[PDB]
């Protein structure tokens, strides 16, 4: 496991700073974020300075997708069996209440729960919201 690189990141920072929120941002975000864990995705978003209102639209989509994920994935009875991972909640997938190894476990269980791919999907939905507002 490798936590994102200053370069793929300085790239994203420059994509967002020039191309604004033109549709091009979305394919780029998908490339720059291949195999990312939720924590990597959040560090890429957190690096984006300013564009406060757009960032709040993104957050609103993330919060809404996380709540839907919860709605459609009831919390299994605890206590969790030893050598088992609890199932991820929405907040876990968005990386606010999960750890990186936990993220990694999920991505690596057999079968896997692809938390990175799921959160990335929520992120892209929010990016589409931004793009349709600003362009």
């Amino acid at each position: 496991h490798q936590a994102i690189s200053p370069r793929t990141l300085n790239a994203w920072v420059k994509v967002v700073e020039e191309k604004a929120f033109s549709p091009e941002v979305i394919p780029m975000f998908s490339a720059l974020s291949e195999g990312a864990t939720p924590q990597d995705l959040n560090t890429m978003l957190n690096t984006v300075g300013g564009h406060q209102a757009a960032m709040q639209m993104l957050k609103e989509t993330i919060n809404e997708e996380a709540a839907e994920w919860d709605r459609l994935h009831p919390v299994a009875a605890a206590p969790i069996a030893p050598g088992q991972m609890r199932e991820p909640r929405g907040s876990d997938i968005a990386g606010t209440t999960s750890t990186l190894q936990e993220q990694i476990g999920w991505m690596t269980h057999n079968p896997p729960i692809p938390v990175g791919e799921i959160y990335k999907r929520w992120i892209i939905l929010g990016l589409n919201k931004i793009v349709r507002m600003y362009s």
Binding site: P74, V75, A76, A77, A78, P79, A81, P82, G83
Partner: protein, 165 residues
Amino acid sequence: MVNPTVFFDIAVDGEPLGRVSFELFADKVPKTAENFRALSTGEKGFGYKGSCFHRIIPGFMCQGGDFTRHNGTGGKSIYGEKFEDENFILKHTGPGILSMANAGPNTNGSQFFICTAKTEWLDGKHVVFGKVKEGMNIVEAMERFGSRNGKTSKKITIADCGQLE
């Protein structure tokens, strides 16, 4: 006595296995104790008689109490609603401890588990409310029907249950 005693007569695919009794610590967690008590006598018109131990994990625990859906997604408290974690004063100190299963903080319903090992990491997430008095060897027998994921190999049911004295 302040602390009631409850029995479960356990059967395996209808055949009698034996009886397990519990002391309930009403003197420490009276609201959690009383739910389990009342569910064990059937006095509310519903409860544990005929329900099963749907999840049994060897060297961990035996879980039951879902008498509404029989698979871990159901159960209900006598309180008309899931109830809060009363306290976490009592700890999971070894085999025989009786504690509440839940689905997060302050979601106690009817589901419970009997520990078959020390499970200290559960302290502060499950409310401990009783201990096996007699029949620990029956709980030990029950675990032989379990599996790493908890699926049981035969139907382990509470064929009868009630309050002693």
